[PDB]
Amino acid sequence: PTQCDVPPNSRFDCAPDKAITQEQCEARGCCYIPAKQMGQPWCFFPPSYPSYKLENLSSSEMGYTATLTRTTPTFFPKDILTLRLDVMMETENRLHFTIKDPANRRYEVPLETPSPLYSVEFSEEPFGVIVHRQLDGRVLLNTTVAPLFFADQFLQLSTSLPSQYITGLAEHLSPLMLSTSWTRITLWNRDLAPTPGANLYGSHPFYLALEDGGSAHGVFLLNSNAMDVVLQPSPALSWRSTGGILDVYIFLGPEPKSVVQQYLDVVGYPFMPPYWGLGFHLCRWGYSSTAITRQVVENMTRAHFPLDVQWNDLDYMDSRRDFTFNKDGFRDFPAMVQELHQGGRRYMMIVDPAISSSGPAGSYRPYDEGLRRGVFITNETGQPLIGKVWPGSTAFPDFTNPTALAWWEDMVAEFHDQVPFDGMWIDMNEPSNFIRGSEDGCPNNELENPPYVPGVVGGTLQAATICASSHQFLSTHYNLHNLYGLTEAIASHRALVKARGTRPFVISRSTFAGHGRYAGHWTGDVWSSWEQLASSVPEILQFNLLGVPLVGADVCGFLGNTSEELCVRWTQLGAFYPFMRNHNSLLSLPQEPYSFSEPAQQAMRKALTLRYALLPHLYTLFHQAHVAGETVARPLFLEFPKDSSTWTVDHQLLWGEALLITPVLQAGKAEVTGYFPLGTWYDLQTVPIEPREPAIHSEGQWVTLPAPLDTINVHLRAGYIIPLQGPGLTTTESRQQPMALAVALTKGGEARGELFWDDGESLEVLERGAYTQVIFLARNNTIVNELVRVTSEGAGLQLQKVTVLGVATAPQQVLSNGVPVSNFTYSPDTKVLDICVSLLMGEQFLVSWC
Template identity: 60%
Template sequence: MNTTVAPLLFADQYLQLSTTLASSLVSGLGEHYTPLVLDLNWTSLTLWNRDMAPHADANLYGSHPFYMVQEEDGFAHGAFLLNSNAIEVMLQPTPALTWVSTGGILDLYIFLGPDPQSVIRQYLQVIGYPMMPPYWSLGFHLCRWGYATSNATRMVAQRMHSANFPMDVQWNDLDYADKRRVFTFDPMRFGDLPEMVQEFHKEGMKYILILDPGISSTSPPGTYPPFEDGVKRDVFLKNATGHILIGKVWPGPTAFPDFTNPEARQWWEDCIRIFYSKVPVDGLWIDMNEPSSFVQGSVEGCPDNELEKPPYTPRVVGGQLNSGTICMSAQQKLSSHYNLHNLYGLTEAYATHSALMNIQGRRPFVLSRSSFPGIGRFSAVWTGDVRSDWEQLRFSIAAVLQFSLFGVPLVGADICGFEGNTTEELCVRWMQLGAFYPLMRNHNDKPNAPQEPYVFGQKAQAAMRSALNLRYSLLPFLYTLFHHAHTSADTVARPLFMEFPTDPNCLTLDQQFLWGSSLLISPVLEQGAVELSMYLPAGTWYHLHNGQPFHSNGQYFQLPAPLETINVHVRAGHIIPQQEPALTTAASRGNPFFLTVALSTSGRAWGDLFWDDGHGLRTFETRNYCYVTFTAGQSQIVSDPLNLSGALASLLLGGLRVFGVSSPPLYVVANGEKVSDFTYQADIKVLTVTSLALPMSKTFTVQWFP
């Protein structure tokens, strides 16, 4: 780092550090509504967690004081300022940047790379590798604020499945809660919530509801144990005078748990346990945890002191640090809220993850809105209250890729948008893109037009169904990518510059992205478009749908993209494990597998599959899993099961598609026996073999003979 551009300033509540940059290609410093590569032309980014719908020039829900610089020739380095105070980063065209923090210490990590993948791996060695998600959480999730009764909620799930849309998880927003108080359910509208959840479970589905941290403080005495028990156990944040700080959220006046206090974490677990004994939820959605408050500071205001009005306030929405949240002078066990504000969501995610693990005894699912480095160890994240419009659709890709760099692979945006009304075309295109968000959830706000897939016309429904089935067929591949993220800090949704760091066309590309190193997703992002200009890095790429080859020198291709199409390409040299889709992952996990084999010019390819029970704790660490590699070469494909628990025991390989088979095979042999069901398309050189029944848990060989 070259810090000669400006002096180091170190004063109480003001720390400033500047550095020149090796290039102007800088990514990171989230969470903001920006392209993947930041604009260095005298822009300022503030890191201060805030309940704020995504738009330009605003501090949003999360703070990630980490950036990566792409240097010349494919090299890269990164920097991480481990500091939870309010931070402003000034980007300058020199290129240079200046950190200004309102407190804490200068704890700076430099990651030397040498390439982008290594930078992220080094960063995750500091903040922690991401958790392994439960398999079902990779299915389709459906939510809406406004499913007003348990019967309305039931109907949604029924209509989804009777219209043949795959879906794993039904959600409820705050509608379920009695007087909007968490840890309760409304006896009139959701009186049979426990029965509804059991019905979902019988159908192989899961159920998640929202859990806000604000605890109602005005229920009549003796009627709301979470608050009374919390007061007894002294778990709430205090104001400067030592009384419980009262803010205002959905239920009215509320107290806020202090998750830095071990007693509060235990109280939180007890509250969840009592609720879970009535309503056996499968995961928890922790929202409003910046923390958000509808009054500035508290119902009594905030004191006039240097924490509420520091000598320097970064550019935050509302102009003051306590805008839209609680007083900075609020006391927590570890420190003042001034120092801990950006950590509130992370500490709540940790408490919720640990509570669910203890209560359910299986892999927890938590979704958090507020975030800070390290949250990927405990939680998924979504990008908040996005608007139903084409610009937000486009920007969602950069947002998802940013979180990938931040060690939060399980991330998505609300499909079709949360605020405002979607159109049919926008919703179809968003479902096609959303089928490739690592976390796929459609979520809508109360006043808006409905956007469940079944409300649209037949043509739109067919396009959405096709995108969902494609995603479900790819879940074994996606799950394997999550295994590599969890064990090796690989990225799941991946910017092209991570995989092709020396290709100048990839350095700023954020309208296309990869799954792992082998699947390229090129969504339609413009209204009315029926064709797409798509970049293919140098090499051979095959259309996933039909195996049509594209030989690229690193160039743009003009491809048809009618409404029912999302363009997905497989990179030559890779094998993608897939499975016949079904309406839930509980059903699809028992279906036959098939392989998509994309041969390189020399006729080779490689792929792998990680498989376990889909929900057990520490299955990798305890070797309770199966891992199979697939190798293609010399006109044959061989599997090699390397670690075998019982998870693959009854599962079969039903078929395979081989792209790039240069001459028509006369016959095909599987495990030494001739196969009668195979076809060859000479025009695009695709061999398809069906009606196989080879056990996945044993080595198999499939050969073709010209």
């Protein structure tokens, strides 16, 4: 047929709900053409398939409103035949539209609200929204490409994509750039060890699409229901959600970093972590007493390994229950944590969401009080839904209930009164259930058995979690499931603020869009494998683009047994995770830095030492994330979008604009090949911290670098200045040391950098102005600071070393504030000028040479 002449790559599936025969396909009013070898749909929509018609388009002060009408039913039940379209032109960068049922309030995700670069026009029949980039006329969105479906439990909205390059749609084990070859991406939070093609712990319905020439846009669908996102190679995308409404934001960039910042303007800028949170964290399942746990710190200390935060897993609890500690191995738990604090370290422990429900009445306050106050998710007969997790039978708190929030704050404060822990590791908050749904199964209804089930592991919404039709304060679990973790992270953030009075530190397994405003994330139960080491790079980068910059993987891997070589390379790379924790499973061989051979220990110690030297810089990068929606770890394409060679690179990463990390990610290698964008890149090993080229002069090219077992390649971009600080086994110690600058000159002698400094943990620092901020500038053989703000926290900072890279000629003299310096060295082979000074970050200085 004429209408069935649709190019293969542009066929949209008219049988996404079930296996179909040719006769049934045709009776739907669809085209049946088998592919010649999910894949390309054999049953697909002709361009005439019934959609909605636009009627009564009107122009308001905020934008546009219209009615959308479907005349012919779809093959799903409960089509909503009359919809309302609202288009809001919110800023020059942000376009917002919604499609709703004007006759019924439908579930919506709870969220605080925050010439243009876009234009918008509409197709009448079939209905579509078309968004152009005004500067070049590129079509960014065109929803005319397939029918709009809007049924009670099935929404589908499709669009063309501007290129084959698209990233986002966490959480999945994938390259940073997603495959457009008939790929079904499922968002349904699920406790499963990361494996390819699976819905994992978190769900972020946001994508960033690259455009030829290096501009980009982003799209956020504000919808928390179970969904599939289907990418096809035309290229095009289909959102398929199981409930809610279509609430769509388009972010115009044009730069990828701006797209990310614009997205974070809606969902929230990243929270500012405490400085100590950027130190090394060490944990395992199996530190089964305070004595053993104390030995970890002792063993790290004796072998000169920095450690800011000691953790415990389930070991601490009384019979694996929250807000208890056993009176055998952990009898003296309070004293252990007090002692940690006396030495300048912090303490973290695991908290699960589910609460043991099986104890005698009156014997377990978290449950007894939860029951009294009605804090738990309830079932059909109004009683707590009971599942099974680590303690046995458990009820599940409803973190959408304000009373549950108050209860959680209370349980956290009461436990903190016994043991003064410094944050919360919130696990199992998908929510995870070791049985299907509940001890009593689940009822048979349309929420438990919906007409479209996304491609979830196990083929049901109840698999490894609770019943979809269970009740929460705001809605059913069906609607709220993908928010469970997020809502717990918000509750825990608030609880920690109230209990401790300083910045919270929450690390969560499950996440949703906006998570980064409250908490960080670790990537869960990764294997100790070379595969998963390599896969951690794109995953950490992905979460940075999603505004969760406090992210990392379990260093050396969680599951199975690490090898020495793997743990060296994983420690080297993982020292560049913004959140750095080595964590290990119960039955695995030990993998603490001190448990390896001497050469391995040296390499691991070096990795940790370099991280601690860089902490002032890392902290400043977090400040930029927090105040301007920047990324901390970023892919090369975020920083060099106009170099199309960067677009598929995800085994290198940047810290901010200027530090390029090129890890070895394979066994047996003593070299690595990395992409170097146009520029001069100085080898960071030429900066004295306490055939290798000193500078890579790149045109935009791949470069093979020596990378023996003791080495990770780290390069500093010309034009940038990096603040550093002296060593310590903790940040309590390190923050008191002298600082240094590493100054990477351009060929013309230019560089710029910055330092942000506050007390490291107080609330409302920016609001109160309790911070110091300094800019550094190199120009014409001088280095100066520029004092943006100087306060008490910052006025003691001693600058004792200035290292200048790319100094072509040996200076005859070096001056600090007009006075010849006590000592400097120049190396003619590396072009490094190293200068001892006695200066203050917060007082104006001028260092010069000639």
